[PDB]
mmCIF file with all atom_site columns, C-alpha atoms in Angstrom:
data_model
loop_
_atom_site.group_PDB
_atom_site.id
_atom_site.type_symbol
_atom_site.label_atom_id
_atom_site.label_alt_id
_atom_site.label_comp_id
_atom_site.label_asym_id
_atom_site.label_entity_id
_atom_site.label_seq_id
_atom_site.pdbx_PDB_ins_code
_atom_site.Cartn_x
_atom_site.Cartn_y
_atom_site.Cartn_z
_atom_site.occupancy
_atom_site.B_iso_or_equiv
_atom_site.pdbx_formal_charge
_atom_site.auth_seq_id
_atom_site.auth_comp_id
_atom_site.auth_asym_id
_atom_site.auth_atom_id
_atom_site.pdbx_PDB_model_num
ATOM 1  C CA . UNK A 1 1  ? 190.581 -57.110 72.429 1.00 57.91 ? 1  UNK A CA 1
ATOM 2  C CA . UNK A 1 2  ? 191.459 -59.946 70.110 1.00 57.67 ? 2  UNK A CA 1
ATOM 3  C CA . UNK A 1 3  ? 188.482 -62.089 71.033 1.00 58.69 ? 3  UNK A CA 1
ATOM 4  C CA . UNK A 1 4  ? 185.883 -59.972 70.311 1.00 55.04 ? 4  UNK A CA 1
ATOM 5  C CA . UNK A 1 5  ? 187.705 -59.428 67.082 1.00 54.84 ? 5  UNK A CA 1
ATOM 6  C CA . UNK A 1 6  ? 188.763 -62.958 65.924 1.00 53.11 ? 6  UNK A CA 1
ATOM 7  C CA . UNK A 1 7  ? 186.343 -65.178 68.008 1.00 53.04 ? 7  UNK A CA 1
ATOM 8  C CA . UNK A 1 8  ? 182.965 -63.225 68.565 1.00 51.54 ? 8  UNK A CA 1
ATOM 9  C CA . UNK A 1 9  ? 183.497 -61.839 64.770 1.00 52.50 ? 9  UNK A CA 1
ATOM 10 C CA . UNK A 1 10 ? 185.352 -63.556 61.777 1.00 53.62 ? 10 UNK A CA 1
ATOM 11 C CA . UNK A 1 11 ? 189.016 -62.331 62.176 1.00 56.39 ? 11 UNK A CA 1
ATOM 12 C CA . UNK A 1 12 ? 191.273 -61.529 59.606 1.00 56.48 ? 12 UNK A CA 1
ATOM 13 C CA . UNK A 1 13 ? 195.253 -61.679 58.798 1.00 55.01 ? 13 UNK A CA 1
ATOM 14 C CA . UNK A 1 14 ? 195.846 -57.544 59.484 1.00 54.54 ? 14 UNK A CA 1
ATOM 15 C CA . UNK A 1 15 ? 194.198 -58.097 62.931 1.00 52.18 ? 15 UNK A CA 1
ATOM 16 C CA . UNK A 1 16 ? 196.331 -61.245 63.744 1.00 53.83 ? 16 UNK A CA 1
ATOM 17 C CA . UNK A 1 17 ? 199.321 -59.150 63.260 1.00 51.13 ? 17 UNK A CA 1
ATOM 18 C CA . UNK A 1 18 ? 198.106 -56.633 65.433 1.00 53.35 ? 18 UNK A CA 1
ATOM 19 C CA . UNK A 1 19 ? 199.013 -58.829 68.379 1.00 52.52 ? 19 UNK A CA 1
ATOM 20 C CA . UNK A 1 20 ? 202.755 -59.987 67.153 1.00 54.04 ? 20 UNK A CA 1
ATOM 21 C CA . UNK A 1 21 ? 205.909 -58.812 68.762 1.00 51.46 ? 21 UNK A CA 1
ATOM 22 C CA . UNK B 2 1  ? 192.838 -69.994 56.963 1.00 55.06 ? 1  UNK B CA 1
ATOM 23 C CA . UNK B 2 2  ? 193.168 -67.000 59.255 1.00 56.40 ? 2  UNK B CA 1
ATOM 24 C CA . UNK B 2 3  ? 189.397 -65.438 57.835 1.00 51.26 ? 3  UNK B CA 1
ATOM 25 C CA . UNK B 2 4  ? 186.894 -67.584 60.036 1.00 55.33 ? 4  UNK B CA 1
ATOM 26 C CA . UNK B 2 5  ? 186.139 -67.498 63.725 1.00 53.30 ? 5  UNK B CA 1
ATOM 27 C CA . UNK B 2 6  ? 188.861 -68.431 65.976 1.00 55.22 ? 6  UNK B CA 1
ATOM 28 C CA . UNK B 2 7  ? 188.120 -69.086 69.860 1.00 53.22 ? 7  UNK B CA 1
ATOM 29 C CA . UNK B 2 8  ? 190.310 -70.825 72.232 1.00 53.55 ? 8  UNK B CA 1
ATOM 30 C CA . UNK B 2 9  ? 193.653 -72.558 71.391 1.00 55.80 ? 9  UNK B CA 1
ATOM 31 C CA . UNK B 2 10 ? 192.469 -72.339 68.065 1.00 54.57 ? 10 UNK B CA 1
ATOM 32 C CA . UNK B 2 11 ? 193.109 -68.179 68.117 1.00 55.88 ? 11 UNK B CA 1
ATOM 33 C CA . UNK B 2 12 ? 196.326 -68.683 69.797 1.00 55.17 ? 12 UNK B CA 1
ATOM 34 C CA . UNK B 2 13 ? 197.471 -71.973 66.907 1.00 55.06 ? 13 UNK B CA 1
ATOM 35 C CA . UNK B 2 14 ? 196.769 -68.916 64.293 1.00 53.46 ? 14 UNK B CA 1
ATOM 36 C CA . UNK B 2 15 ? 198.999 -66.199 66.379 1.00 55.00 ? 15 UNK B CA 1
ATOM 37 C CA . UNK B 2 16 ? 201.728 -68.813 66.883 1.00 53.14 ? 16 UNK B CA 1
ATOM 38 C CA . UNK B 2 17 ? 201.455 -69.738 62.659 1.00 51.57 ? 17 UNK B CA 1
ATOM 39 C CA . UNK B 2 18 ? 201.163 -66.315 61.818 1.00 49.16 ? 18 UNK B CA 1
ATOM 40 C CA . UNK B 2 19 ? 203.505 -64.169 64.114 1.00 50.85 ? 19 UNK B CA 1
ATOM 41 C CA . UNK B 2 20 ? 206.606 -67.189 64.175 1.00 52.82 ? 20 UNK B CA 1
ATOM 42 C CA . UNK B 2 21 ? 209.956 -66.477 65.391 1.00 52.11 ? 21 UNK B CA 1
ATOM 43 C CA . UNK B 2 22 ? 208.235 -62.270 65.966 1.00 54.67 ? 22 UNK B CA 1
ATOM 44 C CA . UNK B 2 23 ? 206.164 -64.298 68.994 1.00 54.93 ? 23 UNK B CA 1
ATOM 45 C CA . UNK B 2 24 ? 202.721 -62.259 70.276 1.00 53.05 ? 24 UNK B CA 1
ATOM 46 C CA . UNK B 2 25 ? 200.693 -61.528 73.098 1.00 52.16 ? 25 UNK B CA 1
ATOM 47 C CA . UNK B 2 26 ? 197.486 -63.392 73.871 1.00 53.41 ? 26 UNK B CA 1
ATOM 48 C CA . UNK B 2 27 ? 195.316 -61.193 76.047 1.00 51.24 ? 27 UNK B CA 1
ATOM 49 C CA . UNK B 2 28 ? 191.386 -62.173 75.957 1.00 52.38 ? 28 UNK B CA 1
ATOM 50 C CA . UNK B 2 29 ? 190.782 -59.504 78.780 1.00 47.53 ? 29 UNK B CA 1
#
């Protein structure tokens, strides 16, 4: 999920918008 | 400001910057 990509790892803007509606 | 480690209410402050009036779903399983 999004933590273990943008909190346990560094996250980036292409993952962020992964999660928008 | 989006490329570092974001935990918290710090992950969902970048959604809520980054997705805008689109909105997002915050689900840390």
């Amino acid at each position: 999920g999004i933590v273990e990509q943008c909190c346990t790892s560094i996250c980036s803007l292409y993952q962020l918008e992964n999660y928008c509606g | 400001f989006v490329n570092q480690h974001l935990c918290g209410s710090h992950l969902v402050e970048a959604l809520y910057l980054v997705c805008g009036e689109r909105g997002f779903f915050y689900t840390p399983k």
